Each structure stands twice: as structure tokens, then as C-alpha cells.
Amino acid sequence: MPKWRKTHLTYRIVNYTPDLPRDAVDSAIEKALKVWEEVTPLTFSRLYEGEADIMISFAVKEHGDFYSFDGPGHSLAHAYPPGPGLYGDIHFDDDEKWTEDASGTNLFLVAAHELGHSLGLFHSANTEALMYPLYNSFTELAQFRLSQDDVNGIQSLYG
């Protein structure tokens, strides 16, 4: 599906990286959802059981889907566009070291990118977009703001 055919979405944080206290994972993800919420009619509600739209987890190597992670570096995370079952979900490579700040791989910045794919965005060619596929944003964390390119792409889907 190119987009969610509904406005009110659910997410759940299925498991937790040992890199970070639970509250830290929670705030990062909440913040990442907020970035998108605030330029769209979409809302996101947290589930703690059962099957949510956007299932968010940490995994290493082979982890249930058809795309094994690859150890430290290379790919840091991947995601699936809108749809049922796996579609919508976000997997973070726990062979990276997830951080609250930019001392390691910033969870918030990578969640925010991957959530773009969960909503329907593809990669951007603009090195200044969030949707840029290279871990590209760490220099702007303290006052993070979506690119107009990202704003354009998300509003083209959801108004």
C-alpha cells in the first residue's frame, strides 16, 4: 500500500535493546512519531499487547523476516511500507550501539527515518533530508527539524 488508508495508527515497542534503559527507548520513539504527527492528520497510540500497525523491535542477524541484519555498521535499521502483518514494522540492528545522544547511533534520528518508510516515504536524493538513506542528521539533534523535502513528501500522502 502507498499509504495507510486510515488516520489513527497504533504502534508497540515489542522488545528493548540492552544498550538503553526502557524509558530512553520510549522517549526516542515517541519523539520520532511526534515529528511526523505534527505535519499530518495522523495520530499514534501505544499498544502493549497483540498486533499493532507499527511493530517496533531490536534484532541481530537473522530475526524472523527475510532480510538478515549484518552486524555492526553497514545497515543500522530497516522498515516496511504501509500494509498488514510485517508491513509497517521497524527493526533496529542491535549490533549497533543505540544512544540517547549522538555518542553512538542515535535511536531517535534512525527511528524518525524508518517511520517515514512505515508511513509510505521512499529514499530522498537530498543529503539534507531525513529520508536520505545515509545516517546523515546527527549534527542537528538539539533542534531537530524535518526538511521541507520531507514535509513535501509526507503531506503529498496525508495532506
Binding site: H74, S75, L76, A77, H78, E114, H117, H123, P133
Partner: protein
């Protein structure tokens, strides 16, 4: 899909095949048909990649079949694989320096040296055999001067440095 960028030296040294080539549904991988014009490493007609960008599938943007591309890839079970985290660039987008790198100079760094991307807050060097790659930090892009004009080479033992 989110990647650490590879410096061209890194890409060369870690890939199984480095070639110049032209490019000519419910399915896990996509494949492009290619025509190899040159091999720089690996002494080939398709390159495979995850089917969506979201799970790191290279999406080819070029509506010119005679355009040559540098592809640095992993060979697995007979097949050449690339992803959004591979080094893939039009040959002609490379600087002359980078072309010499793939042709001749990058191989000097492979055994002795490592390029380390500065993706983090302090950004600390673990070894004198590392060179710190700060193009993204400095110019907001991996396509900066260190990428396009510098290799990470032995100076003396225990010490690699950036050289042109």
C-alpha cells in the same frame, strides 16, 4: 533503511567485485541486468538487491542505458549483491582521483589501514592505522573532499594517514 556510508577505499577493500557496468511483485529481491565494461576487483550480468528501498534495495535512477556505473558489491552463492549501503555511483560522477583509486591506489590501503566515518559526538580514533573521515560532519554529505581526493595509506608502521 539507514546505512553507514562507505568511503570509496572501504567499498573497494570490503567488496568482492568492483566493476564498471551499464544497466540494461511479491518478490524478495530485485535484479538488474548489467553489462560489465571493466573489472577493477574480483578476477557478471546481474546485480541483486532487496526489492524495496525500505529494506535497503538499491533503486536505480538513470533513464540512460549507455551510462556507466561503478558498482562495488558482495558475491554470495554465485550472485552479485548490492544494497542502499553499497558504493554505487555513475563513473562520470567520480573525480579523476577516485577513478585512480579503484584502478590502482585503494589496494595499497586494504591490508594496513581503515577509514572510520565520524558519525558521532566525540568521534574517537581507536588506532593510528585509522583515518577519520569527516566529510559529513564538515560539509553535510559523504561526497566531500576526503571522499573525492584522499586515500587512507601507510605512512610508517602503526600509522596510516590521509594521502592524495
Amino acid at each position: 533503511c539507514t546505512c553507514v556510508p562507505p568511503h570509496p577505499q572501504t567499498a573497494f577493500c570490503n567488496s568482492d567485485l568492483v566493476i564498471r557496468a551499464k544497466f540494461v511483485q511479491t518478490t524478495l529481491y530485485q535484479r538488474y541486468e548489467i553489462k560489465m565494461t571493466k573489472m577493477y576487483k574480483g578476477f557478471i550480468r546481474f546485480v541483486y538487491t532487496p526489492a524495496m528501498e525500505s529494506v535497503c534495495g538499491y533503486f536505480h535512477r538513470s533513464h540512460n542505458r549507455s551510462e556507466e556505473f561503478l558498482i562495488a558489491g558482495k558475491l554470495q552463492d554465485g550472485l552479485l549483491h548490492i544494497t542502499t549501503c553499497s558504493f554505487v555511483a555513475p563513473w562520470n560522477s567520480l573525480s579523476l582521483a577516485q577513478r585512480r583509486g579503484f584502478t590502482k591506489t585503494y589496494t595499497v590501503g586494504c591490508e594496513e589501514c581503515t577509514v572510520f566515518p565520524c558519525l558521532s559526538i566525540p568521534c574517537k580514533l581507536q588506532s593510528g592505522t585509522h583515518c577519520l573521515w569527516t566529510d559529513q560532519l564538515l560539509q553535510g554529505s559523504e561526497k566531500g573532499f576526503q571522499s573525492r581526493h584522499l586515500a587512507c595509506l601507510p605512512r610508517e608502521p602503526g600509522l596510516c594517514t590521509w594521502q592524495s
